[PDB]
Amino acid sequence: RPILEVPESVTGPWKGDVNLPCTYDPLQGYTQVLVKWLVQRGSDPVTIFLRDSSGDHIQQAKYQGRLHVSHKVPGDVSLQLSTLEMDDRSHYTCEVTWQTPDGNQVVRDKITELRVQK
């Protein structure tokens, strides 16, 4: 099984809400130290959200006020968008980094296609 469970595509309603699942089974001994969500445009991704040691940070203006990332359940870093725009259609990447105190590091990422339907 892949570490991150992310569907190959999600369809959301124009002007409404969508959830992009990204989940994993936490492993004892590792700490989640970074979550990044990225969006494609067009041959390179840009970071739209970071969760780091200083909290949650939206990183692109067009997502300000419209983007939430789950945090309640360990292993669930799903992203929700509000007031979906046609220009939100793209491929989105969930990227998670784990470390140990002695410095080992593991990273995984996974891509979903967001479709927006009228």
Epitope: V107, D109, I111
Partner: nanobody
């Protein structure tokens, strides 16, 4: 699908050269990371090379660095493995795989969802 179809295998002399191809079906090729794996007799499947969806980065097993080159053509829905300076240790069945990793995890077979039936490579002393 994607269905993945490999070709290009053969029996070659040590020092020689082959090129494997992998033809993908569907229209979603360009969104997948692509990789090559191999399985030698009486051994487990192992990573060989991978290439990001956008061609931006490539990744190689240490043992094939500088001898093998992976490339892709998103317009022709094909991935290639140029295999130069072949060694007997390179003998194996070679498999093409597609996954939705972006730039991490490409060495792990578990991070791929589609696999071809493979093509056979033998390198002789």
């Amino acid at each position: 699908q994607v269905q993945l179809v490999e070709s290009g295998g053969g029996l070659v002399q040590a020092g020689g050269s082959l090129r494997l191809s992998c033809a993908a079906s569907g229209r979603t090729f360009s969104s997948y990371g692509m990789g090559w794996f191999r399985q030698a007799p009486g051994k487990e499947r192992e990573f060989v090379a991978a290439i990001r969806w956008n061609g931006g980065s490539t990744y190689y097993a240490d043992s094939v660095k500088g001898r093998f080159t992976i490339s892709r053509d998103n317009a022709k829905n094909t991935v290639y493995l140029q295999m130069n300076s072949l060694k007997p240790e390179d003998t194996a069945v070679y498999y093409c795989a597609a996954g939705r990793w972006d730039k991490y995890g490409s060495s792990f077979q578990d991070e791929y969802d589609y696999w071809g039936q493979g093509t056979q490579v033998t390198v002789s002393s």
